[PDB]
């Protein structure tokens, strides 16, 4: 159909973060079986392979910002590939990797569709500017390059010349914030970005939260929604094998509800799954839990309802 | 009183399902202590023993439908015993076993009370017709025999000649669907059976779900409610020792709330607890968790509120 027409793009990348192992995101998510689990329901699955990310050896950092040029080249290659598969009219399922690739993932998406909206589901805001960071790990900094309101607040980081800020601050929604820097909270209150942190989720119930989210985004105009999703935004009971586990996160049920509502919009346009580290499972069973969780999230983004599905023929035959 | 006047009927039966061990439902639920935990609050507890289910050796199956005649004889004996103890005006607490016995449990209940309503709490719909099944395990097929709207859609399965469909499609409510076959979802959308899958529960909150359920059933007319309950409908963190654990289920708190609301109706008439398998506990502590969960569910169906109870005399003496 229009929905569940998928381009799958892997991105085995880790240099935006310290802990090596999130390169085995695409390896694991394909070997666990994702294309297969799509193709039962009417999913026009087309893989486009993992991107051959290069290796700049002299990745001389910025002051705090570490490994800038490899990340910039990576997200540039990714932005090209994602815009390419949105030219196919598919839904750019991207999986990595880390949040640093979401720069290119939303950039190439915005090349094709300038009027998008971002639902950034993460325990973190990831809105660190290169000035306001403390780690300088770029998975903490994707959002700052895409907000037009931070133009002038962004130094020209080497490797990000191709980057243009693409969304406004009133078009992005956070769901599930529970680990926020002082700088991040300051910018988040400064720009007036609508967010639903765990406070508001515990207040409203995830049904009310999703309803207010879709009213905030699509209540003015139907526009292609780009859900991007951290796996640590869930409570780490369900996803232990990820980079920054922060307790008191979203439950499995609530994330499934989020994805089912976003599917029932029918305006899903590009899905991003990041921060899956199989090297952080204390047992491989923990990895299995994290991956089955993420796969169930992705499948629920493409018609797999917990109430179930049926192909539209009479089964009483 | 009118409520908490209990007939307890065990049913040590397993032939509707493959995994041997749910015959130790009555053994375990009595040896954990259930009659005793009833009798403190004013529970006219009367056991009626485990039923002596026979063993037909030449249980020749249907095409997909396996073990039909032993299940049919079992549910016939059960329907006779349940109607017998509803002649005593008690509340037919039945525990098994599996969902195949719920055929006879609701059949004998409908013999006495034709205007009942079923709240089928389960992870599955169990609405497989003999045509639409894939396993042919009859715990996947109780509901198809009781719906009057599937008359003609039900082949004459050997052993189920005594079976008459008893309820309408608009009188049964599902709560907690999260694993539904395509045939099951097709029939569920076909008959317009009101269901509350985990999507709707995550949307509404269990208070709103129970309120809409009791408005949907009793909002027209006071009628005896037959809650029938799977233990896999809860999340398997609380109940691991059951046949089909499906993750993302109902929490323990929500199930307790369901039972407390159904008690506060006061129209509870027959309670069924199925699918308890102690042979599926990886440790006996897992069995202990599952059984204590189910026992607390049953006790909360008979006045045991989490706010507590008191016998109506002055305790300031």
């Amino acid at each position, epitope marked *: 159909a229009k929905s569940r027409t998928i381009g799958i793009i892997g991105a085995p990348f880790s240099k935006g973060q310290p802990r090596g*192992g999130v390169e*085995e995101g695409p*390896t694991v998510l394909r*070997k*666990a*079986g994702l294309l*297969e*689990k799509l*193709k*039962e329901q009417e999913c026009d699955v087309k893989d486009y392979g993992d991107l051959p990310f290069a290796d700049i050896p002299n990745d001389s950092p910025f002051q705090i910002v570490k490994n800038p040029r490899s990340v910039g080249k990576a997200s540039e290659q990714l932005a090209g590939k994602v815009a390419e598969v949105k030219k196919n009219g598919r839904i750019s399922l991207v999986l990595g990797g880390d949040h640093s690739l979401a720069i290119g993932s939303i950039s190439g998406h915005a090349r094709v569709h300038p009027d998008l909206g971002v639902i950034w589901v993460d325990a973190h805001t990831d809105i660190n500017t290169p000035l306001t960071t403390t780690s300088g790990n770029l998975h903490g900094q994707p959002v700052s390059f895409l907000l037009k309101e931070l133009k002038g607040k962004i130094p020209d980081v080497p490797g990000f010349s191709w980057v243009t800020p693409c969304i406004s601050a009133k078009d992005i929604v956070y769901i599930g914030l529970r680990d926020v820097d002082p700088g991040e909270h300051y910018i988040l209150k400064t720009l007036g970005i609508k967010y639903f942190s765990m406070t508001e989720v515990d207040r409203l119930g995830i049904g009310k939260v999703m309803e207010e989210t879709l009213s905030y985004l699509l209540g003015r105009k139907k526009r292609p929604i780009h859900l991007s999703f951290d796996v640590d935004g869930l409570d780490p009971s369900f996803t232990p094998a990820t980079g920054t586990p922060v307790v008191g996160g979203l439950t499995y049920r609530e994330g499934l509800y989020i994805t089912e509502e976003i599917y029932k919009t029918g305006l899903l346009s590009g899905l991003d799954i990041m921060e899956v580290n*199989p*090297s952080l*499972g*204390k*047992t*491989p*069973e*923990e*990895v*299995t839990r994290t991956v*089955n969780t993420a796969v169930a999230i992705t499948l629920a983004c493409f018609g797999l309802a917990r109430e179930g599905n049926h192909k539209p023929i009479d089964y009483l035959n | 009183a009118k409520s908490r006047t209990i007939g307890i009927i065990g049913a040590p039966f397993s032939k509707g399902q*493959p*995994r041997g061990g749910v015959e130790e439902g009555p053994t375990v639920l009595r040896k954990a202590g259930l009659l005793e935990k009833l009798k403190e609050q004013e529970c006219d507890v009367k056991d009626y023993g485990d039923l002596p289910f026979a063993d037909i050796p030449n249980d020749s199956p249907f095409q997909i439908v396996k073990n039909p005649r032993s299940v049919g004889k079992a549910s016939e004996q059960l329907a006779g015993k349940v109607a017998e103890v509803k002649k005593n005006g008690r509340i037919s607490l039945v525990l098994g076993g599996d969902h195949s016995l719920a055929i006879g449990s609701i059949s004998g209940h409908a013999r006495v009370h034709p205007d009942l309503g079923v709240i089928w709490v389960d992870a599955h719909t169990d609405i497989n017709t003999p045509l639409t099944t*894939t*396993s042919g395990n009859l715990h996947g097929q109780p509901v198809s025999f009781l719906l009057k709207e599937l008359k003609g859609k039900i082949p004459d399965v050997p052993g189920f000649s005594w079976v008459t469909p008893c309820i309408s499609a608009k009188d049964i409510v599902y709560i907690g669907l999260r*694993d539904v*076959d*395509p045939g099951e979802h097709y029939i569920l959308k076909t008959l317009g059976i009101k269901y509350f899958s985990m999507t709707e529960v995550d949307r509404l909150g269990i208070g709103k779900v129970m309120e809409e359920t009791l408005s949907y059933l009793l909002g027209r007319k006071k009628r005896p409610i037959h809650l029938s309950f799977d233990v896999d409908g809860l999340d398997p963190s609380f109940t691991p020792a059951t*046949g*089909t654990p*499906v993750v993302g289920g109902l929490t323990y708190r929500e199930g307790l709330y369901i039972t407390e609301e159904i008690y506060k109706t006061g129209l509870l008439s027959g309670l069924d607890i199925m699918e308890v398998n102690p042979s*599926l506990g*990886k440790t006996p502590e897992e069995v202990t968790r599952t059984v204590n969960t189910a026992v607390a569910i049953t006790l909360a169906c008979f006045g045991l509120a989490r706010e507590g109870n008191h016998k109506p005399i002055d305790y300031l003496n």
Partner: antibody
Framework: EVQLVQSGAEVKKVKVSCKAS????????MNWVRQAPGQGLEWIGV????????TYNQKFKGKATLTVDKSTSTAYMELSSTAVYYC?????????WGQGTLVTVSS | EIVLTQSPATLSLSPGERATLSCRASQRISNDLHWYQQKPGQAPRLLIK???QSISGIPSRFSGSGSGTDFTLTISSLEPEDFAVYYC?????????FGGGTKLEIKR
């Protein structure tokens, strides 16, 4: 490709080698599995190469002990006192089967 | 701990037509098992990713079917070298049960 060297045939009344070769280690999970002679296949356990994450079989946690040797790409499964044994990779699949290691439980 | 039932225990069939097998699960594993070709005196050889998909040029005849407990292995182009003890094996439940053996034999 992913090719394995197992060692070895033993008679006991107990370590088993599985040398990874031909590829990049810490990319695939050492997964042990046995086959009783003339019988089906009995899964044992999965260890990560990053760390000794056990997740053994319920029945095999006592007798079988998997260890990790993540420096030199071998791994070891040890045993205390009857079947043939196999090490595979790609835990969701099983495509990278080893040699076959018969051990007898003998006197 | 999901018991995989291979309803043909052993089977004898000629070099010839289709030889569809069956691994019926105990639960709804939902398209999450595999298929194996343990030849005699050999390590097993994987055939199928998830009720489909023909791994790495395993030649022409090993299609399966899913959705969602009755999981089959069709041998469409029988190819009598394929007479081997087959196995199904679940993936997404712990711990990782196998089948039992689905020995294909020669019929003469």
């Amino acid at each position: 490709e992913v090719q394995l060297v197992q060692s070895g045939a033993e008679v006991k009344k107990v370590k088993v080698s599985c040398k990874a070769s031909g590829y990049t280690f810490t990319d695939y999970y050492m997964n042990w599995v046995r086959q009783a002679p003339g019988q089906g296949l009995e899964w044992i356990g999965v260890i990560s190469p990053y760390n000794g994450g056990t997740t053994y079989n319920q029945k095999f946690k006592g007798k079988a002990t998997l260890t990790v040797d993540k420096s030199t790409s071998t791994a070891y499964m040890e045993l205390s006192s009857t079947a043939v044994y196999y090490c595979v990779y790609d835990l969701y699949y099983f495509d990278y089967w080893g040699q076959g290691t018969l051990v007898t439980v003998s006197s | 701990e999901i018991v995989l039932t291979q309803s043909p225990a052993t089977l004898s069939l000629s070099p010839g037509e289709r030889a569809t097998l069956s691994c019926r699960a105990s639960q709804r594993i939902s398209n999450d098992l595999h298929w194996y070709q343990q030849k005699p005196g050999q390590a097993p050889r994987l055939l199928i990713k998830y009720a489909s998909q023909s791994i790495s040029g395993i030649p022409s005849r090993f299609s399966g079917s899913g959705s969602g407990t009755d999981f089959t292995l069709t041998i469409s182009s029988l190819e009598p070298e394929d007479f081997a003890v087959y196995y199904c094996q679940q993936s997404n439940s712990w711990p990782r049960t196998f089948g039992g053996g689905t020995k294909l034999e020669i019929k003469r």
